């Protein structure tokens with residue numbers, strides 16, 4: 001059994017992707033029979049608004065996972081500490097943000113392990129369970145290697161960057177001055193429709 005190395009770009013999700021994720025420790029949705037939803041952010045760059053996002057999440061008591069890179073950890077230690085201190089989960093977005101399908105196995109292991117160890121040493125978060133691949137690029141091989149190292153492969157069902165359903169995993173952004181306002185409105189609006197904002201730990205328990 002040679003794992004396939006053909007690259008795929010995540011988007012939404014079809015039989016191929018569905019079963020690739022299912023067999024290799026991946027998910028992109030939670031339970032679709034409950035109105036629980038899951039906010040996530042990717043943090044490979046700091047645009048200057050993450051503190052304002054964090055302020056909104058604290059005000060609204062909404063948990064999120066922030067998938068961080070090594071560049072982000074080294075350059076934004078104070079924001080990282082806010083993430084841990086204010087009840088969020090810090091996820092793994094790789095050290096240098098390469099496409100996982102373009103690197104050798106030794107390099108992929110270093111790219112994940114370096115971030116995991118840095119998150120644990122810098123913030124004291126106990127476990128780093130969640131990986132989101134750079135650019136949502138994956139193969140059968142990269143999914144399987146990531147799972148073997150003890151991580152879930154966490155994709156998304158809705159992304160919004162200015163150019164909802166039960167179980168949605170949202171990938172939102174902190175790119176401009178107005179994003180914090182939009183987030184606050186979205187949280188309020190979705191709660192009025194009966195949605196509950198939960199953590200990726202809750203997702204796993206939702207079974």
Ligand SMILES: C[As](C)(=O)[O-]
Nearest residue numbers: 042133134135136
């Ligand atoms: C899926 As991305 C553009 O946050 O690496």
Ligand SMILES: [Zn+2]
Nearest residue numbers: 034035036196
């Ligand atoms: Zn609920």
Ligand SMILES: [Zn+2]
Nearest residue numbers: 070071072074
């Ligand atoms: Zn850097």
Ligand SMILES: [Zn+2]
Nearest residue numbers: 042044134135
């Ligand atoms: Zn990224």
Ligand SMILES: [Zn+2]
Nearest residue numbers: 042159161173
């Ligand atoms: Zn994005």
